[PDB]
Amino acid sequence: LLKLFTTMELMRWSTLVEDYGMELRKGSLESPATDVFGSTEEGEKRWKDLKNRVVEHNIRIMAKYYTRITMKRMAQLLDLSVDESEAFLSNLVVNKTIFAKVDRLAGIINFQRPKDPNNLLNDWSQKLNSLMSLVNKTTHLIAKEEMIHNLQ
Amino acid sequence: KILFTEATRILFFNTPKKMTDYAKKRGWVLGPNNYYTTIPSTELAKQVIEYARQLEMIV
Amino acid sequence: HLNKPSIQALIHGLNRHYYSITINYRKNELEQKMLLNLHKKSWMEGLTLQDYSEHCKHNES
Amino acid sequence: AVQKVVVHPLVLLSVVDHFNRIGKVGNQKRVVGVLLGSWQKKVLDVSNSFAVPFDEDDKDDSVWFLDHDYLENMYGMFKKVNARERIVGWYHTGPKLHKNDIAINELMKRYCPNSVLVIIDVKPKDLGLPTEAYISVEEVHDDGTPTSKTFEHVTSEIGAEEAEEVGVEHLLRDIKDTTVGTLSQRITNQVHGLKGLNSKLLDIRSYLEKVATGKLPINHQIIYQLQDVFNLLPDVSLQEFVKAFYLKTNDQMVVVYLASLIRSVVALHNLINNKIANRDAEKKEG
Amino acid sequence: IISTHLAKLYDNLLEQNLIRVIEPFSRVQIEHISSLIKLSKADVERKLSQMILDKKFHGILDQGEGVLIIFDEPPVDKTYEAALETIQNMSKVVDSLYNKAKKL
Amino acid sequence: EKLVSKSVFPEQANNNEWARYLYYTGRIKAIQLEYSEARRTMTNALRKAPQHTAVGFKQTVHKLLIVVELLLGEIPDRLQFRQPSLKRSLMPYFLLTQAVRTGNLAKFNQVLDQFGEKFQADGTYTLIIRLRHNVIKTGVRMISLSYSRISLADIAQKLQLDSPEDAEFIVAKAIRDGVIEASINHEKGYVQSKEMIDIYSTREPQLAFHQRISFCLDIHNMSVKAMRFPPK
Amino acid sequence: TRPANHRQLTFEEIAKSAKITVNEVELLVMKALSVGLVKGSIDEVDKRVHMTWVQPRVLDLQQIKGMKDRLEFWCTDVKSMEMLVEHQAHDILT
């Protein structure tokens, strides 16, 4: 569970329960139920809290490795209704840690402010003088293969 | 796109056959349901080179 | 007589104890072309664009 | 180790002088000497060098001579002259690496552990090849290949300190230089950049010709870096880059209207003043 | 002096609520913002119109469908600001040159 | 006109002669129906026309540019109907323009009957015939500038065309020329105009700026060539 | 297979090709980014994936020849524009 909450890749809440829920909400024979996720009132509070934490971990990992996600689709990819997911993403963005901007029909999650002309030509010029790794490419094709040119 | 019926009505070809012949005479075709850029980077590059030329080569 | 002796050297005995011999620098074309590489930038900066944001700020100034 | 190797425009002249003084009769076409210099665990700069008596025989490229006590003696003399430079690497002409390069490097690794080959190209000085500096590395050939040595290229710069660069300038001061970049010189620089790009293109194409027909072995990291570089090419399509028209016309504002109209007005102002001045000169003369 | 002052405070706090929210959103229905803010459609529409008209909150209202849009105005325009004023500056220069021509 | 096409005017010719030639070719192409180039040329000539003198010249040029403009649909600026040296002289043409902008056939007919001698006096009676027959195109022009989309029934109502088919034919003829840019959707009845795309990021500013900077470069080069230093 | 002419791959292509559900393309793309083989991004709204990846492969000598031809095309484009600029600027190059 800590792997699926630490490494990348989406956190499927449904299989999250189907793989760890006999073990979070219930008590395992090896280890009894945690006092944080029992049927107690604080347990259910943390239960909905994690139902929103899958939302925020999803949001963070997509912020590093997604561009856009649709409101219905991400809602079912975190197994909530649209409105509460919007509210929680609002809490994630207001405290200045997540970039997002939501439309009624788009709900894109990115600030790609979208790459301004100055910045996008800066990226292109970078990749062009990163394409000047072609000079390393040709000097290495002549050097590391010149110890082959003398070896034929 | 212009419909077959209204085209026949407004093309002043009283015979629909005449309208069809005048339609084939042009490339303006019937339609399925009866319902009839880049940065060239050369000419502009020539332009900027010309500007540089007018700056250089003395008067 | 193409070059003039200096006052400093003249006071310190030039043209009285020693004469200044004209100095000529033997520099063939090969050495010139090799020295030209000191400031020959590259084939890259002839194609490397200046930073667009810095370009805009320079233009505004 | 070293992310950059700086070659002063003195060791270059030293190599040229050595090559000339040898090739007066020394048609070996390649001469080997020792290059000193201040040694850093950072960017390396070569401040001086001397020429050791090197002999090579074309038979099997395995019989050769390098008088090492001469190396030590000359280094002692340089220490007496200036103890600051320490043995750093070596040089040889004949831009095509021979077979004894790596063996000579192993020989010279005792006097300095991080010995670097610094090849000096003498005759071919067309576009972009003043020098190429190499360093031996201890890897067989790759993760799963037999043993070799495979000198490693290090980025080289030609840089000078004060009181050496001034000698270069005085040696220069032909119609060359003009450090300030006029529009003419900048366009010439762009043309030279295109020419260099095309030359590198022809070089890589030639190697790929030699590999495709089987004359040269497929070298896996080479092919990998190819696939990377042709993957790395940008796309002028995807009409978000094409919205560079924004900045192109923004430039056209400052080049087209401001400076050009100002220049035209200035030229007209210079014109009318002459026309008054000529008129006044005429009047002073009926 | 307390009706006016508290009315001003109510308007200001309405503004603070409307900016502290809608920061997450870039395109949100007026119905959503009104239900989250508990005003009538017409009153909140007038308030948003006043807010944008005062340039307090950058955006524009598409009542043809009934949505509020958000954007920003890039300040690169300073170069054109200099350009136009320099244009009429050179125009006055040209006028003085015209007078100098009248001298000829 | 035929002589004009095979004769190239010298660029070095003096300003007033250039203005005269521009006026003559503009009249030729205005009575030759090249209205866009006509108005461009008369605007150029008025820019080259003397400010103080040539009152008759500027009066004739103003009259013909007025008729050319409203034939093309453009409304002449009222200020040129206000200077004392032109006011009463264009007063016949001022009443002409009043009738054209109002577009009422009754006042139009009364203005024609009252000022036809002035209309032919400038060789514009046929020109004012085409004017009387292009006022409708002018009306359609402001109608389409004001409205992104408009039903042809609404066109006939605002223009008094009395028929949707007549409105369709007239608007089709008008949109044939470069007066109105639109995209007629006969599936529903739209006259949806072309999307007003951003002029920036459209290469149009680049072309306009290229032409202008070329003009400035030629001006600078000619100025630097015309320094003309004396011998002594 | 697609030489960046149409980079945007619809989820139907990955679904039929990789024999997966369109719910799992995003997961496997994320895994591939995480390990370090590809560095693309996902557009769920239009069901597309952008790919800018730095993982090469062995290259099948016929593919060596094809990439040689591509290099030839781009190098002759470079040469042609070099002659164009040289001819247009011959007055200034001197």
Tab-separated table of N, CA, C and O in Angstrom, chain G residues 22-58:
chain	number	residue	atom	x	y	z
G	22	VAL	N	-8.474	0.769	-22.332
G	22	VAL	CA	-8.106	2.177	-22.343
G	22	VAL	C	-8.001	2.759	-20.943
G	22	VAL	O	-7.538	3.891	-20.782
G	23	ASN	N	-8.441	2.019	-19.924
G	23	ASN	CA	-8.254	2.471	-18.551
G	23	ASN	C	-6.817	2.264	-18.084
G	23	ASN	O	-6.383	2.924	-17.136
G	24	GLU	N	-6.066	1.372	-18.741
G	24	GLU	CA	-4.736	0.945	-18.309
G	24	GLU	C	-3.597	1.534	-19.136
G	24	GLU	O	-2.426	1.373	-18.754
G	25	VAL	N	-3.894	2.131	-20.293
G	25	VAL	CA	-2.855	2.835	-21.040
G	25	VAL	C	-2.193	3.893	-20.173
G	25	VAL	O	-0.963	4.017	-20.161
G	26	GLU	N	-2.989	4.670	-19.438
G	26	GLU	CA	-2.431	5.703	-18.576
G	26	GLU	C	-1.510	5.097	-17.526
G	26	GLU	O	-0.418	5.615	-17.265
G	27	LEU	N	-1.929	3.979	-16.926
G	27	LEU	CA	-1.111	3.334	-15.904
G	27	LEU	C	0.227	2.884	-16.466
G	27	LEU	O	1.276	3.115	-15.850
G	28	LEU	N	0.219	2.225	-17.627
G	28	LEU	CA	1.480	1.710	-18.158
G	28	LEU	C	2.371	2.840	-18.660
G	28	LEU	O	3.600	2.766	-18.555
G	29	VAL	N	1.772	3.900	-19.209
G	29	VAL	CA	2.564	5.074	-19.555
G	29	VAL	C	3.230	5.644	-18.313
G	29	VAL	O	4.421	5.973	-18.330
G	30	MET	N	2.480	5.754	-17.214
G	30	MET	CA	3.049	6.263	-15.970
G	30	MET	C	4.191	5.380	-15.489
G	30	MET	O	5.228	5.877	-15.039
G	31	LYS	N	4.015	4.061	-15.575
G	31	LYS	CA	5.081	3.145	-15.179
G	31	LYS	C	6.326	3.344	-16.039
G	31	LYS	O	7.452	3.365	-15.525
G	32	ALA	N	6.138	3.495	-17.350
G	32	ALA	CA	7.269	3.661	-18.255
G	32	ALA	C	7.998	4.972	-17.989
G	32	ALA	O	9.228	5.042	-18.081
G	33	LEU	N	7.251	6.034	-17.682
G	33	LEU	CA	7.894	7.278	-17.266
G	33	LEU	C	8.649	7.092	-15.957
G	33	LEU	O	9.763	7.605	-15.795
G	34	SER	N	8.057	6.361	-15.009
G	34	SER	CA	8.668	6.212	-13.693
G	34	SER	C	9.990	5.463	-13.773
G	34	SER	O	10.973	5.858	-13.137
G	35	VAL	N	10.037	4.371	-14.543
G	35	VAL	CA	11.285	3.617	-14.660
G	35	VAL	C	12.375	4.422	-15.351
G	35	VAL	O	13.548	4.313	-14.971
G	36	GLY	N	12.023	5.251	-16.327
G	36	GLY	CA	12.979	6.115	-16.986
G	36	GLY	C	13.191	5.854	-18.459
G	36	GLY	O	14.244	6.227	-18.987
G	37	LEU	N	12.228	5.233	-19.139
G	37	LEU	CA	12.427	4.878	-20.541
G	37	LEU	C	11.798	5.908	-21.473
G	37	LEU	O	12.377	6.257	-22.508
G	38	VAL	N	10.612	6.407	-21.125
G	38	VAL	CA	9.938	7.423	-21.921
G	38	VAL	C	9.618	8.610	-21.022
G	38	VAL	O	9.506	8.483	-19.800
G	39	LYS	N	9.489	9.782	-21.642
G	39	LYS	CA	9.213	11.032	-20.934
G	39	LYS	C	8.106	11.814	-21.632
G	39	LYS	O	8.225	13.013	-21.892
G	40	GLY	N	7.011	11.140	-21.947
G	40	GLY	CA	5.862	11.755	-22.575
G	40	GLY	C	4.849	12.270	-21.574
G	40	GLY	O	5.152	12.471	-20.392
G	41	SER	N	3.625	12.487	-22.052
G	41	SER	CA	2.547	12.999	-21.215
G	41	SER	C	1.217	12.551	-21.806
G	41	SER	O	1.135	12.152	-22.970
G	42	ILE	N	0.168	12.635	-20.989
G	42	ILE	CA	-1.134	12.053	-21.302
G	42	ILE	C	-2.177	13.158	-21.386
G	42	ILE	O	-2.281	13.995	-20.481
G	43	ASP	N	-2.955	13.152	-22.467
G	43	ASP	CA	-4.112	14.027	-22.640
G	43	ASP	C	-5.351	13.137	-22.610
G	43	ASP	O	-5.721	12.525	-23.613
G	44	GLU	N	-5.992	13.069	-21.443
G	44	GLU	CA	-7.179	12.234	-21.308
G	44	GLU	C	-8.393	12.871	-21.971
G	44	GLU	O	-9.292	12.158	-22.429
G	45	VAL	N	-8.427	14.204	-22.047
G	45	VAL	CA	-9.608	14.893	-22.558
G	45	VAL	C	-9.907	14.470	-23.989
G	45	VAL	O	-11.041	14.100	-24.319
G	46	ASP	N	-8.903	14.510	-24.858
G	46	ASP	CA	-9.058	14.081	-26.240
G	46	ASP	C	-8.617	12.642	-26.460
G	46	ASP	O	-8.598	12.183	-27.607
G	47	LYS	N	-8.262	11.926	-25.390
G	47	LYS	CA	-7.794	10.542	-25.463
G	47	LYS	C	-6.556	10.431	-26.354
G	47	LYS	O	-6.524	9.689	-27.337
G	48	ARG	N	-5.529	11.198	-25.993
G	48	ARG	CA	-4.272	11.197	-26.724
G	48	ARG	C	-3.117	11.170	-25.734
G	48	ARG	O	-3.271	11.496	-24.555
G	49	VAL	N	-1.951	10.765	-26.230
G	49	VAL	CA	-0.720	10.746	-25.450
G	49	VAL	C	0.363	11.441	-26.259
G	49	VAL	O	0.569	11.116	-27.436
G	50	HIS	N	1.041	12.401	-25.643
G	50	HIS	CA	2.205	13.018	-26.259
G	50	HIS	C	3.455	12.265	-25.827
G	50	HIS	O	3.603	11.904	-24.658
G	51	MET	N	4.353	12.017	-26.778
G	51	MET	CA	5.545	11.219	-26.522
G	51	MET	C	6.781	11.996	-26.941
G	51	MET	O	6.902	12.399	-28.102
G	52	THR	N	7.691	12.208	-25.991
G	52	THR	CA	9.037	12.720	-26.249
G	52	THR	C	9.964	11.825	-25.433
G	52	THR	O	10.240	12.107	-24.264
G	53	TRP	N	10.439	10.745	-26.046
G	53	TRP	CA	11.123	9.683	-25.324
G	53	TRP	C	12.568	9.553	-25.787
G	53	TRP	O	12.904	9.871	-26.930
G	54	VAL	N	13.422	9.082	-24.878
G	54	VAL	CA	14.862	9.054	-25.106
G	54	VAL	C	15.409	7.639	-24.980
G	54	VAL	O	16.554	7.444	-24.558
G	55	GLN	N	14.604	6.642	-25.338
G	55	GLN	CA	15.049	5.252	-25.293
G	55	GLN	C	15.300	4.726	-26.699
G	55	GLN	O	14.349	4.544	-27.475
G	56	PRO	N	16.553	4.474	-27.075
G	56	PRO	CA	16.841	3.926	-28.407
G	56	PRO	C	16.823	2.406	-28.440
G	56	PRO	O	16.539	1.761	-27.426
G	57	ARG	N	17.133	1.825	-29.598
G	57	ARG	CA	17.102	0.378	-29.769
G	57	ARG	C	18.117	-0.008	-30.838
G	57	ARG	O	18.707	0.850	-31.499
G	58	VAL	N	18.318	-1.320	-30.994
G	58	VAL	CA	19.113	-1.811	-32.117
G	58	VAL	C	18.365	-1.523	-33.418
G	58	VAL	O	17.136	-1.378	-33.445
